[PDB]
Design a protein around this ligand. Structure first.
Ligand SMILES: Nc1ncnc2c1ncn2[C@@H]1O[C@H](CSCC[C@H](N)C(=O)O)[C@@H](O)[C@H]1O
Lengths: 265, 265
């Protein structure tokens, strides 16, 4: 009679909360989805071993089209868990699944976990200064999406930071790198000429948040565009005007050039 | 030797991540602060029992003025952990403490935990649509803080949602309720008259996120301003223009007036 939406956290199998783990262990059936994002620091096998339960992974179609036929039926007479990377309901489509549960007469509860949306706090940038967020999508064919460029423009204009989620091919396990994202942004700039993203733009790269050894780097595009930030996943942030304390953290912790203390504050 | 900044999560002792718990259990000394937020579903005793270590609680003064005298010295010859509610670097000034750690020759690591900043996804509002955040501070003496009003104004004009962290005076055991925040906002509106926060404004209240049954309510200020949302902590959200799916969730899950389904495109 109960469905639990449980977040797996940021990077590996230990990023689930104690609450999430204990609840998952007591569930009769455990499902999971790895299409909104992936858990790069672990494997389904390691997650299954930790939870001590077999996990049925669902595709995007299984969820969007058949959630009420695959998951909810079992939730009617059993305790069922639905695992998702990060924090449940951060992904935009997740929320509506609770409505489906309600329609099916199934109670649902949410067990939170760390999300990249909040983990960016480790960049030293003040959380309240982050504005609207966006996703940098790979262009393909004659389709060249550029809405994320306008998001940066509008946030930066108001002195706000922009969190950019990077594209991912869940099935093919292909992750867009911060390097690729920077190249794309320079390409959009060359097309729009808005003076929003150039070689002189200060950026912050956060790779493998959740890991004990994430890569946190800050610097100008001209210097970071070909830098190796390590294995995925990567997150790109375009800061707005910096508070001196934010800048000092970027210099001391993220190896940012001293120049940012006079140019971006 | 090492210093770990470990988040404890949203509501109770089990909101810590498995990673955080396994590391905390092996540390030589464990410190913590409980003034940046309120964990309404646990006690110091329960946290100590879970980690199996005595926790020395520090006051705001101990941390801001003496972190380098109380915590860092021990981290030079031992494994030390510093615990905080929610995520340690979200809506706190703790990031700067990593700079102090470095200057003292102490390596630091960060272990994330669920944060209210991302938990608001449970309201059904799209996380990417949240703009700049703000804090509603208690007026004191003859000074009445009003910056948060301008934040809502700026976000709303852009169709973005506004997360409003509410004030806390941990030593006085004072936790601002959503009701008190609404009363303050109405007073600022009477002054600035920007049509930003009125009795007809739609708002969302999230209380005790992290618990299994948090209070999630949406409706007009005139109807919610005197409603009992239960024990603290509370956060107030002023949505911008809603997507149909957001409206549907607010109606189905947060009890919002069915009339909000009819969005004005
Ligand atoms: N479980 C919870 N439910 C509702 N609001 C919460 C909350 N935890 C924190 N808050 C809100 O956030 C304020 C503290 S701000 C510190 C936040 C913390 N670092 C985190 O990551 O969550 C509180 O005064 C309250 O308004």
């Amino acid at each position: 009679m109960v469905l639990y939406f449980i977040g797996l956290g940021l990077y590996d199998e230990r990023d689930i909360t104690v609450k999430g783990l204990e609840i998952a262990k007591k569930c009769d059936y455990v499902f999971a989805e790895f299409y909104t994002s992936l858990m790069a620091g672990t494997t389904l096998g390691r997650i299954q071993k930790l939870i001590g339960k077999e996990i049925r992974v669902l595709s995007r179609e299984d969820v969007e089209l058949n959630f009420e036929n695959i998951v909810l039926p079992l939730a009617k007479e059993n305790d069922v868990a639905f695992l998702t990377p990060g924090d449940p309901l951060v992904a935009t489509t997740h929320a509506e699944l609770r409505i489906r549960a309600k329609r099916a007469g199934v109670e649902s509860y949410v067990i939170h976990a760390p999300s990249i949306y909040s983990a960016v706090g480790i960049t030293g940038l003040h959380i309240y200064k982050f504005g609207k967020s966006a996703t940098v999508a790979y262009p393909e064919g004659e389709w060249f999406p550029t809405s994320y460029y306008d998001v940066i423009k509008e946030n930066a204009e108001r002195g706000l930071h922009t969190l950019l989620f990077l594209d991912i091919k869940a099935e093919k396990r292909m992750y867009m790198t911060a390097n690729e994202a920077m190249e794309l942004l320079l390409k959009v700039e060359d097309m729009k000429k808005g003076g929003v993203f150039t070689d002189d733009t200060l950026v912050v790269v956060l790779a493998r948040a959740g890991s004990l050894n994430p890569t946190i780097r800050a610097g100008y595009v001209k210097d970071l565009i070909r830098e190796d930030f390590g294995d995925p996943p990567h997150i790109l942030i375009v800061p707005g005007k910096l508070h001196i304390v934010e800048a000092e953290y970027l210099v001391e912790i993220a190896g940012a050039p001293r120049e940012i203390l006079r140019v971006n504050v």
